[PDB]
Design a protein around this ligand. Structure first.
Ligand SMILES: [Cl-]
Ligand SMILES: [Fe+2]
Ligand SMILES: [Fe+2]
Ligand code: NA
Ligand code: NA
Ligand code: NA
Ligand code: NA
Lengths: 196, 196
């Protein structure tokens, strides 16, 4: 229909313009917050392909990578009742819920290296944005708040996320290196303005 | 084999860096010339979908658009004997032959505003790169050099080319506005390094 891809195009240039200032981390996050907020304020732009859950696993659909890999934009699609392992990120980020809701559980470790939840579980509603900086709390376990519907969140990461070597942590406290990869081997073409 | 997608990721990055120093047109073109030349020096990187001829029309497969739309990178696929009409561009651009060959005829205008071939036709061989710009010469007709095979060239343009309002030129020298648009509504995912 009127898939409104101009808001994706707008978010992307504006994040990039912002980044062209070499802002310090915390300024960057502060100033991007409203930008992602304006992008998830309404749910009328996300291409269908980039919204399909899987029955076995969550999906990360790559929407855009910056020419200099200063950021990537990803659509995180949880099927009903799905849950990630405990893992870190290693780059700045922002998350904004588009539809459904998700839970975020922060983690820390005992001197042995076993993880344990820390602070309580945050619930993220359609519309809300929280900045992540690894300089604060990098390790977490996230999950679909709902057990019976699809939830989707739009993420922004300060790198090509599917190139970042990060870590997943078992209950027993072993660090497994992982690289997330992407669900889609093709990105949507948000760029064909030959439609008006 | 495995596609050498890192050549493309590298080119994308390097040209954006170059663009970050705000060069003037002649320096941008002198410096970008070698970067594209390296990309089209060996033919081990273009995804197969982005190399597909059409029997009716030449194809324009979008590869990448820069976050701030400072450039875009397009794969231009010619089937046997295809030819464009006479047209302009209104942005700087570099063209780099990947496989096959294309003929280039620049055009100039007489006192009544009617276009005519200006100068000798230029043949573009694999690994060669030519520049174009309103300053340096913008109006031309291009065709596949062969009628017995496919030709591909890699085009870089200082805008989101398929959103740029340009024009084709009638024998009587009048515009007919056009916006090229892209043969592909999905872009290739160059970015999933977790392949290796
Ligand atoms: Cl030249
Ligand atoms: Fe995470
Ligand atoms: Fe042209
Ligand atoms: Na290269
Ligand atoms: Na190829
Ligand atoms: Na000329
Ligand atoms: Na493709």
């Amino acid at each position: 229909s009127i898939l409104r891809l101009d808001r994706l195009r707008q978010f992307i240039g504006e994040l990039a313009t912002l980044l062209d200032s070499r802002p310090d981390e915390s300024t960057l996050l502060a100033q991007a917050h409203p930008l992602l907020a304006e992008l998830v304020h309404q749910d009328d732009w996300l291409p269908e392909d980039c919204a399909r859950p899987d029955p076995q696993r969550y999906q990360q659909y790559l929407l855009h990578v910056d020419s200099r890999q200063r950021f990537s934009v990803v659509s995180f699609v949880w099927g009903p009742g799905q849950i990630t392992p405990v893992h870190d990120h290693r780059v700045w980020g922002l998350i904004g819920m588009l539809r459904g809701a998700e839970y975020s559980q922060p983690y820390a470790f005992d001197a042995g290296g076993r993880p344990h939840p820390s602070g309580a579980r945050r619930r993220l509603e359609p519309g809300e944005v929280e900045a992540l900086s690894p300089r604060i709390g990098d390790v977490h376990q996230v999950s679909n708040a709902f057990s019976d519907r699809t939830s989707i969140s739009i993420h922004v990461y300060g790198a090509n996320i599917g190139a970042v070597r990060r870590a997943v942590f078992s209950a027993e406290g072993e660090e497994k290196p992982f690289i997330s990869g992407y669900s889609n081997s093709r990105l949507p073409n948000i760029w064909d303005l030959s439609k008006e």
